[PDB]
Design a binder for this molecule. Sequence first.
Ligand code: NI
Lengths: 311, 311, 311, 311
Amino acid sequence: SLKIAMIGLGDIAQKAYLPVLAQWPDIELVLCTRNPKVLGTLATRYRVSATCTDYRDVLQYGVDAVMIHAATDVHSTLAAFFLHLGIPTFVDKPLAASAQECENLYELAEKHHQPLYVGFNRRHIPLYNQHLSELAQQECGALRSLRWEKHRHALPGDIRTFVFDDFIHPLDSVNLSRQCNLDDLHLTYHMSEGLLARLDVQWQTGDTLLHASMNRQFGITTEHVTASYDNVAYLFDSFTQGKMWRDNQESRVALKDWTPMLASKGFDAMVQDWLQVAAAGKLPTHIIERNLASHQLAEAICQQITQQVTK
Amino acid sequence: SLKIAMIGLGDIAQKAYLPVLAQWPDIELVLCTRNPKVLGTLATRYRVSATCTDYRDVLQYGVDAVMIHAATDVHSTLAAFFLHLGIPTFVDKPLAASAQECENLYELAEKHHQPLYVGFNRRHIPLYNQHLSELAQQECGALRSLRWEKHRHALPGDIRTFVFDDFIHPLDSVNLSRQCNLDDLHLTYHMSEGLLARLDVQWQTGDTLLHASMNRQFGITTEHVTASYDNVAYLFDSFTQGKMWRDNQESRVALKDWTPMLASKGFDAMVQDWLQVAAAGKLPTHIIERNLASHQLAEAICQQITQQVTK
Amino acid sequence: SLKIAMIGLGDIAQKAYLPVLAQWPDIELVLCTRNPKVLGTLATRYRVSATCTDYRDVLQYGVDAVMIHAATDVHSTLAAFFLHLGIPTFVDKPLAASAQECENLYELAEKHHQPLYVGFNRRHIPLYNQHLSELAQQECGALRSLRWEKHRHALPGDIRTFVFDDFIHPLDSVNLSRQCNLDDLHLTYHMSEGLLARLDVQWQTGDTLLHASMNRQFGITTEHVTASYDNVAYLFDSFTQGKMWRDNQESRVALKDWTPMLASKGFDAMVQDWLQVAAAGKLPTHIIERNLASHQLAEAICQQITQQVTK
Amino acid sequence: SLKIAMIGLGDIAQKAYLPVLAQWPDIELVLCTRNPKVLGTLATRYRVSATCTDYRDVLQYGVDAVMIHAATDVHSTLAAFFLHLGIPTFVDKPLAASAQECENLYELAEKHHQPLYVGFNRRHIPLYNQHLSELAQQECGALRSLRWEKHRHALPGDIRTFVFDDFIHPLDSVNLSRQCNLDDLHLTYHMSEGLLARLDVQWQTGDTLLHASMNRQFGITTEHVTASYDNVAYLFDSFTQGKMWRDNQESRVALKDWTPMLASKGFDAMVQDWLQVAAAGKLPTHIIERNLASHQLAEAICQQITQQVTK
Ligand code: NI
């Protein structure tokens, strides 16, 4: 059995995590959030006796690990608190607001031999990891190309936020390699009256061309993933449907009916991994390098665009 | 009314060109090809009188212009010929096997003040030009991105052939900036057992990201075009259908029913542009520069992969 | 705030109802089922105190209503029981294996002035009722036609089960005219080996053509709904996606993102209506009549077939 | 070798027939039509020497067969003129304006022992006859169901024209059992502003449910064909593409690229047949029984509707 604390019950905590762990058997929750009104409503709805208003009062529940869903602003603070207190810590992307804080956090995590899992659901998409072993293995494998497009309609933003809070999803999902700088990388972008409209990062490591694309001034909000091997390719227009091309024939691949929405988006699968990491008390090295790399690449991309625009 | 001579009745000539001109009103055809058997077969099929076997006899019928559909290894020889004799010449892409010859040919055309039209049908695709005026205008306009993909199933080939006889399609089609080198351009490729499998070329001109992609070892033979502007986008999965995305809504855009197949592939629209060009003895400068640019770009790509591969 | 008791925790209960209710706000649950093993397993999973094995002890907790999810052959018993005790009763379709029982149960419920709600989730499909008001309001309105197709791959069965436990879905969903017989109705079917393979019931009410189609020996398992008005049509290939044809144009209509799976299948919407009814001790007349009619029609369909076959 | 005369060069003759027979090998044409202007233009455009302005000045060319593409009101007259003289005749749907006239023309046909081919391209569609052999053989076969929908956006009309000139297509295509009356058949329809808007004819012959529907007041103009066998089904949304459902999996079936438009709509295959019938002088029985049947069923459906709308 496992006991977990959830600090910061905001939009995502309520939209996905809570509903996923609330029904998860053999798991005991310890809800924590500053707003007592919200806290109580939720605790009652999902029948949770372990209530907490001050994240520090969590120590009084001997938890096996905590999950932080609060805003980025208070990520490190809360993360560092449980880490230097010898407690596994889960955190929603982005781990921190800057690459340096990400490095420091992981340093503290190592100085205490504690795991620091960063929530990246797009590494656990059931339909994608089913036809694409590479994504499940987090390697480049036999992939010849992989393009991850996540767009939005009329929704530009400031460089920083755009990259760390949104682009990081396609950027990390495609980061099957461990790209951490802009070396041998091709960064392109457009800007509409002061803001970032579309970002394109693409590079080739080995025999695999990785491409992360985000056009937030697109004609419609949608996310597509295209991957190709030798004489075989897939194109997913969503997380539940797709097309498989082989032998010059096209067929559709899809999740089985009744598969819950939060599962298709990979939260169920991710929590699974998280728990195993929490229980084992250790997160595999490549995952730690994956995490840092993606965050470092974000920083490189930000400073680069910022410098070019300002200059 | 014009009298056009067709030199070199091969595959493309029989499949597209010939059947299109033999339909055009006020046009007299003068078939010409090495093989006398094939000549007579077609001559009978399209009930044409003016038959010839030696391109030199073509002059006898007092032709108003010539259309060369022979192999690439004989374009220069045939083109130069009618150019010296001052006759508007048409040549099916590619113009020549190298940028050197192309440059010569055009220099030769300028000298004799004759038009030299290069057959690029993907600049006349009715459905695309109806929705992307930038293509009809052959400019970048408001385009924020334009991606042209032309894939094939299990069909790798040698650099030269692959680039000059296939990739030249998506490359030129996307080359609205008249690019003629690898300056600030990204080029990725993948060799397979001695052959070129996939080639990806993209660069940013002003506020437009151009991208030509060709995977000759794709899971299926298909050609997709994707264009985007601010808050507007399009994605065509063929020359007859496509999706339009605007106001965060997806609608379908398609070619009128009963549109002849060859017309959908822009052949009629091209022959029309060509006949006017020949009948006017003039060919706009921007078009000439595009032809030249696309060919020099192809040259640059070949003498890049070949060099690298041999290392 | 209501206290609902769920009697009979079978598959449908564990897959949709239980998960939706155990999450519903201001509702205390009282689980009840024969098997004490499953009873406790579920009770632990959804953290519920009010446990019970005999459908009688349920009255002890002073429930405001009961939801019977047991087998069809136990509905009448359970239903009648609480209906007499004067408690709003909910029963998952079908109400009973015969129209007679249905008529009895409703006649009974009318005496005790209690509401008897039947579980027809396909009447609360959020994406369908959002676009087609006729379905929301349960009328024919401007509908010139409505076709509900629900097919299965290689799954024939006996007339009874096929109709009362399956076909009733599409049949009822289309029964917007309260059809309670075979009057001016066209019934068609096919028997594979010794079972019912496909059934097709279609009739016309005024200016509306209704059609229920089920081919349980179809090449694939899917469900398509097609609705048409004057110069307007819709075709949904699922509960989340569909296309709209208007002004000779095709546009995509889809369910908002992050919508829970069960919700898209109209369960949340149905439970809502159910609770309101239960808390109001009243159930609109037009609803009851539709319920009876659909079961009376199912009865009629079963008979004419069984007869015509044995004949 | 063959020589065919074409009487009546309208829009269909110019859009489909002339072009198809213009490149046909071993076939000499004898263009005939009222209007002189049009005539010469076409004779020059397709380079035909055999000109004509009167369907009577036709035997001066010793034709082997004739093709009438004129209006319906002049079909009989012309059809009889050549069947008298003893000439294989080809007529475009509908054969005549009434079932009476059809039987008449067909009685005069066997009277002079001459074939009377009716142009029904929907029987010779390459993509459909490929996967659906029953349509190629023209018999119910193993089909369990076959639905042919042909809708139009905002285009209602008078019963007569709506039926014989348009509905005749789907009605005949699904008529594999030579249905000729309203026996055991289900007919529904809808009128609007005094015109016919939608028409649906459905009946079951053996183990095959055949359904023809046409809603000329649909949201878009499109034609769909659905066909189901035991545990197998096909859905064609066009004449060149479709979906094949088998083993609960969906795959795409389509026409090879570069297949001319007129070929996909079946004109090539039909003409092919038409010729093999003109040369052979004999037309298979079932084909004659089918054509009559379709026109008889057409009349039945007309008078039937005309009566109720009048009663
Ligand atoms: Ni409405």
